[PDB]
Design a protein around this nucleic acid. Sequence first.
RNA 1: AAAUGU
RNA 2: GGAGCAAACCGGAUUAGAUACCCGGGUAGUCCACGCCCUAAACGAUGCGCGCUAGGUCUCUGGGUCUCCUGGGGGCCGAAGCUA
RNA 3: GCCGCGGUAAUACGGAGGGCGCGAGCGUUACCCGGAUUCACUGGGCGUAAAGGGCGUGUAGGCGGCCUGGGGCGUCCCAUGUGA
Lengths: 151, 237, 138, 208
Amino acid sequence: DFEEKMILIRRTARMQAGGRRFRFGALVVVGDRQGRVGLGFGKAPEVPLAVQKAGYYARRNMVEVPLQNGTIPHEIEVEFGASKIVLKPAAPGTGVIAGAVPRAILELAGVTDILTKELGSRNPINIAYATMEALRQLRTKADVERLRKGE
Amino acid sequence: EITVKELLEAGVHFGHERKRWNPKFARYIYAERNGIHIIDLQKTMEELERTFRFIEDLAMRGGTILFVGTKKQAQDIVRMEAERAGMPYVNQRWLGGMLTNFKTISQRVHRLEELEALFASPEIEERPKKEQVRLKHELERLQKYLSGFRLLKRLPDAIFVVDPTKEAIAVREARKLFIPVIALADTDSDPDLVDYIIPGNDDAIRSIQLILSRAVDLIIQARGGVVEPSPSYALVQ
Amino acid sequence: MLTDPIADMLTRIRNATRVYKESTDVPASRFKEEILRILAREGFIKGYERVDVDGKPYLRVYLKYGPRRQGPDPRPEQVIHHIRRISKPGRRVYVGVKEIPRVRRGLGIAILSTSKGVLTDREARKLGVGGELICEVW
Amino acid sequence: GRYIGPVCRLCRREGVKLYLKGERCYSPKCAMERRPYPPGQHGQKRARRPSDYAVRLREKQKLRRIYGISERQFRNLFEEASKKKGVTGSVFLGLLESRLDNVVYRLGFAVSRRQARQLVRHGHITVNGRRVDLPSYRVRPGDEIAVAEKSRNLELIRQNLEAMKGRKVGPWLSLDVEGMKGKFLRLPDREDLALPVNEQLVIEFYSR
RNA sequence: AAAUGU
RNA sequence: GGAGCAAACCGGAUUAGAUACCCGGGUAGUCCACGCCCUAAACGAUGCGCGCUAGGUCUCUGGGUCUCCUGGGGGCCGAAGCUA
RNA sequence: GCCGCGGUAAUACGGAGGGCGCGAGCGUUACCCGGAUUCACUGGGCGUAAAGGGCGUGUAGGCGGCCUGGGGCGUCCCAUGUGA
Ligand SMILES: [Mg+2]
Ligand SMILES: [Mg+2]
Ligand SMILES: [Mg+2]
Ligand SMILES: [Mg+2]
Ligand SMILES: [Mg+2]
Ligand SMILES: [Mg+2]
Ligand SMILES: [Mg+2]
Ligand SMILES: [Mg+2]
Ligand SMILES: [Mg+2]
Ligand SMILES: [Mg+2]
Ligand SMILES: [Mg+2]
Ligand SMILES: [Mg+2]
Ligand SMILES: [Mg+2]
Ligand SMILES: [Mg+2]
Ligand SMILES: [Mg+2]
Ligand SMILES: [Mg+2]
Ligand SMILES: [Mg+2]
Ligand SMILES: [Mg+2]
Ligand SMILES: [Mg+2]
Ligand SMILES: [Mg+2]
Ligand SMILES: [Mg+2]
Ligand SMILES: [Mg+2]
Ligand SMILES: [Mg+2]
Ligand SMILES: [Mg+2]
Ligand SMILES: [Mg+2]
Ligand SMILES: [Mg+2]
Ligand SMILES: [Mg+2]
Ligand SMILES: [Mg+2]
Ligand SMILES: [Mg+2]
Ligand SMILES: [Mg+2]
Ligand SMILES: [Mg+2]
Ligand SMILES: [Mg+2]
Ligand SMILES: [Mg+2]
Ligand SMILES: [Mg+2]
Ligand SMILES: [Mg+2]
Ligand SMILES: [Mg+2]
Ligand SMILES: [Mg+2]
Ligand SMILES: [Zn+2]
C-alpha cells in the first residue's frame, strides 16, 4: 500500500502561570512511488499521536503526479508565502537533485530524475506546502489540449 | 406533469432584495424597479429545469437529501416537506462539523435514541426524581436540534438550502465533501458556490412553500405516489 | 499615454481572466492583431471581433477557460496560466534563431516579431529566423 | 597502500555479509554469523535513526569496501562515470568491474580480491600474453586473462581454479578451466548483478 | 511623594 | 514693536537630593519689515504619469431628462488578488 | 569554524579503551569561486524589517499613441573569410 515518511518533528511551547507547557509537531509524507503522494501536518500533546494523525491528515491532500518515466511533464516554480521551489525535469540517469524535504516526496511519487532549488525562506514546513502546490499545477501535453480546444 | 410555470410565480418569487446584494447574482437578474432587484424567471425555471434534471435521477436511484433552512421565514415549511418526503432536515439551528465531523455529532443522536430507550423502559421510576427531569430536560433539547437530523445514518448526496448566505457554513461543509449543493437563493447570496440553484425569493414563505412543497412532489414521483396536496396556504398568508 | 500598448493588452487579458469574464476590449493595431490571432490559432482564446466603442475602435477578445471544478472554490482552471511581456521599451529582447525558448517544454509558446512577422518558437525555428521575442504564454 | 588487517569487522559494521575472506566469509562464521552486530564496545546496543547523510555514507563505503580500494582511485571512476553518457552513473559498476584484480576474483583464479591482487602484483597473471602486474587495469571486451607459464602449476591456482566447476560464471564471463584463461565479453548491465547496494545513494552522496 | 536589585 | 505667554535666570514648595515635575516672579523669543539659515516623526514613515481588475455605505463640490444617473474630491467596510 | 562546553557524576578539557574518516599520507593556516537569489542581466527589494528625494519647476538623458509609404540603422537569415 502507501509509504509513510516524516521529514519533520519539532517541539513548540506555549507558556502558562508557572512553567511552560508543550506540544509536538510532525510533518509526514505518504507515497506510493507510482505517482501518488500526500502531506499533512500533525500537532498533538505528545509525539506519535501527531505522527499518527499526520499520516491521517497526510492521506488527504493527495495528488495526481503525471510522471513521464521518473520525471515531470515540464519545468515549474511555485511561491508559498515567501518560500520558493524550482522544479526542473531531467533526462534519465540523472538523480533526484534536491534538499531533504522535497526529495522526501518526489521519490514517493516516483521521480528518479529531477533538478531542484530552494529559494527565499528555506523553512521546511512552508517549503513542503509549496512543492505539493507545484505537483498539483503540473500538466501533461494531454492535460493541455483538453483545454486548448473548442466547447 | 412535474412542474410549475411563471403564472405560479406571482407570490413574491420574482425578487424582494436589492443593494443588500452580491453582484455575482448578475445573469440571474432582470432589472431594477422600485429600487428592488428583480430576476427573470425564464432562467429560474431553466435552472430548475437543469436543477430538477439532477434531482430526479438522484431521487429515483434512492439517494438522500438533507434539508437546511433556519430563517423564521422558512422554519416549519421545510420540516413538513422533509417529513412529507421522509427525508432528514435542519429546521432549527445548524451545527458546525455536522457533516465534516459527522461521525462525532452522530454519536449524539445515539444518546438521543439511548435516551428514548428510557421513556417506558423498566428503570425510569428506578432513577431518582431529580435526574428524571434533567434527562427529560436533556431530552427535549436533544430532539429539538436533532429531530430532522435523527433520520439519515450517513452523509447525504445533496443538500437543499433556503438561503445559502446563512447556511454557507453548511454549504462550506458540504462543498468540502464533494457534496452536491442545491439552494433557493435570491440576491442575498451568490451562485458559483452553488451546484444547482433555485434563483428566486429565498424569503417570504410564498416562494419557499411554492418551490419547497412542489420539490417534495418531484421526489415521490420517482419513489412512489404523489399523494394529496401537503399543507401550505393555512395561516400561511 | 501608455509607454507599452502590447503589455497593456496582455495585462488587460490577465486582469480579465482572473475574474472569469466573456470578453475583453482593447485598443486596436495591425500589430496587436497578428499577435492575438495566434492566441486563437493556438486556441488560448475563443477569438475576437474588431468592433468600435464610443466612435473608437477596439478588439473584443473572448476568453476561454475550463470545467467548473468542484470542492471549495469551484473556479475552473485557466487556459492562460501565465503570460508576461519580455522585450520591453526599457529593454528590447532580440534572439538569433538558435537562442530560442523551450517554453514549459513545448507546452508553452513564445511569440516573436521577425523578418516574416509574428511567428512562434516552433515556426521561427522551422522558417529559420528568430527576432524580437514579444512574450511567453501558457 | 591498501586496507590491511581486520576484515571480518566489515562483513559486519555495514550490517550485511559481503564475502571478503576466502572460505571463512563463505563458511558458517563470516564475522557476522556469530556476531551480526557492529564492532567495538558499543556493538550490542540499539542503533539510533541514521542521518540521511549517514545512510548515504554507509552505502558508499560498503560498495568500496566490497571492491576494496582507496577513496583516491574510487572517486575518479565516479566522476569519469558521472561525466559519460546517458545513465552516467549506474555504468559505474561496469568501470569497477573492468578492474583486473576484480575480474580475477570473478574468474575464480582466486577467492578474495585481496588474494587476487597479490597475484596481479606478483605478476602471476597475464593479459593477451602480456605480463600485467597492475590491479587497476581497466580491461575491455575480448581481452584475455591467463596464468603465466612459470605459474601454470602452483598449488594455489589448481584448487582455486578447480572448485569453480559448479556455477555459471557471469554472463560477461567465460573460462577454459583446463586452459587457464578467460575472456571479458561485455559490459555487465545493472541487471547482471543485484549487488546488496543501492547505487542511487552513492550518486546522491558524492554530489555533496 | 516614593529610588534600587552581579 | 512688546499685552499675553515664556527657554535661560531668581524665588516658594516636594524630595535623600530636585540644577525637574506643581507654585510666584521673569529676559531673549513669540508679533512687523528686509536679508540670511534649509533642518524635522518635513508622515499616508507609501516618488510621478497612463492603463487594466467586484460592490456597499458616508460626505464635499459640479452637471444632468435633478429618483437616479454621471464628473472630481474626502473617509469607512470590503470581490478577486498581494502580504512575513 | 559558528551555536557554545568546564561550577565533584563533563559522550565538548586531559589521558585511556573503543569507534568514525583518509592513507604515504593526514591536518592547519592564508587566498580565489561556489554555496550567497547576500549587487539579484539570468535572479531581489524600499507602509511598520536597511531603503521614496521635504515639496515644485525644469536641462541633458531614458521612454513614447493610431494609418501608408521610402530608407533597412538596429534586429533576423544564408553564404564566405577570420577565429593560431
Ligand atoms: Mg514574496
Ligand atoms: Mg533568508
Ligand atoms: Mg536556515
Ligand atoms: Mg550523463
Ligand atoms: Mg545605586
Ligand atoms: Mg507668568
Ligand atoms: Mg525651582
Ligand atoms: Mg528650595
Ligand atoms: Mg540632606
Ligand atoms: Mg513658571
Ligand atoms: Mg525619510
Ligand atoms: Mg502614492
Ligand atoms: Mg521624483
Ligand atoms: Mg466641484
Ligand atoms: Mg445636481
Ligand atoms: Mg471617490
Ligand atoms: Mg479597507
Ligand atoms: Mg474576501
Ligand atoms: Mg574527582
Ligand atoms: Mg567525572
Ligand atoms: Mg553538574
Ligand atoms: Mg569537538
Ligand atoms: Mg575527550
Ligand atoms: Mg585508540
Ligand atoms: Mg581509538
Ligand atoms: Mg534585476
Ligand atoms: Mg532582499
Ligand atoms: Mg515603488
Ligand atoms: Mg524603527
Ligand atoms: Mg524603516
Ligand atoms: Mg514623500
Ligand atoms: Mg522631487
Ligand atoms: Mg533638501
Ligand atoms: Mg526631454
Ligand atoms: Mg523618442
Ligand atoms: Mg513609435
Ligand atoms: Mg564566423
Ligand atoms: Zn569475514
